[PDB]
Amino acid sequence: DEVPELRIEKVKENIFLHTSYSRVNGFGLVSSNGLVVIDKGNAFIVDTPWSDRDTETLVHWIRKNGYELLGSVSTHWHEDRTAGIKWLNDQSISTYATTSTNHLLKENKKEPAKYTLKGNESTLVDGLIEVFYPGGGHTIDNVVVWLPKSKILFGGCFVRSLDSEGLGYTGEAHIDQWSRSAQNALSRYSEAQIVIPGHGKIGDIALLKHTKSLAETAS
């Protein structure tokens, strides 16, 4: 039960991908994706690392590199997205999640984000980061994050990588809605050039298409 260390790798100008891991009953060591988005000296975090140590590591690197850290958002409630919220709260770094995500954190006796994003859409950092509820999928609360300056959509675990043979854990999934929700995102972000899933390799808008088809067959 050793697990690698976090890493952080430039995706393109001002966008870094953070990868970290956890060991999971009946599945093993599992990688997990998140971002650091930069705009003119400012950093915002999309999803936390899957542990405090990795969260700490990630923050230190943001500070070391001189960025002002405006906060983090989580894209659904499960630990792989939110584990670091508590540590972040205690170090007075602002945490965000939607209403529906915060409800499920509390309702599952987890530390809630400090601030709450209301409605289906919200913006963060002067329009640099948009948050959108495409509808039910992986979970009832899942949101995507769109980065218009970069033409990047961070799908979170709402989007499956191309080599996924299925939808992953569907205990809390809305399988029959997922296909429509995926289509909602496809219509809305036809401009998207890079799409980043919650687990696995990044690609283009093809990931949203594959995810859509997976939802169709899972029905």
Q: Is residue 101 helix, strand or coil?
A: helix
* 78 touches Zn ion (CB under 5 A): yes
Residue 138, marked binder: yes
The residue (of 78 and 212) whose beta carbon lies closer to Zn ion is 78
Give the pair of three-digit tokens for residue 23.
């060991």
Shortest distance in whole angstroms from residue 196 CB to Zn ion: 12
Alpha-carbon separation of residue 27 from 23, 30, 185 (angstroms): 8, 8, 29
**CB 63 → Zn ion: shortest distance, Å?**
27
The answer on whether 60 is annotated among ligand-binding residues is no
Q: Residue 20 or 179: which CB sits closer to Zn ion? A: 20
Q: Angle CA(184)–CA(140)–CA(204) in degrees, nearest 5?
A: 40
**Helices 206-218 & 175-188 angle (0-180, nearest 10):** 160
Coil, strand, or helix at residue 11? strand
- In whole angstroms, the minimum distance from the beta carbon of 161 to Zn ion comes to 11
Identify how many contiguous H helices and E strands the chain contains and give both numbers.
Answer: 6, 12
Using the minimum distance from each CB to Zn ion, give the nearer residue, 148 or 200. Answer: 200
Check whether 78 is labelled as a binding-site residue. Answer: yes
Known binder of ligand: residue 1? no
- Give the residue, chosen from 47, 54, 80, 141, that forms a contact with Zn ion under the rule CB under 5 A: 80
Minimum distance from residue 157 beta carbon to Zn ion (Å): 3
Do residues 47 and 17 lie in contact, with contact meaning Cβ atoms separated by under 8 Å? Answer: no
Chain positions 159 to 198 lying near Zn ion, rule: CB under 5 A, are 198
Size of the site for Zn ion (CB under 5 A): 4
Rg for the chain, CA atoms, rounded:
16
Q: Which of residues 132-161 bind Zn ion (CB under 5 A)?
A: 157
Give the residues lining the site for Zn ion (CB under 5 A). 78, 80, 157, 198
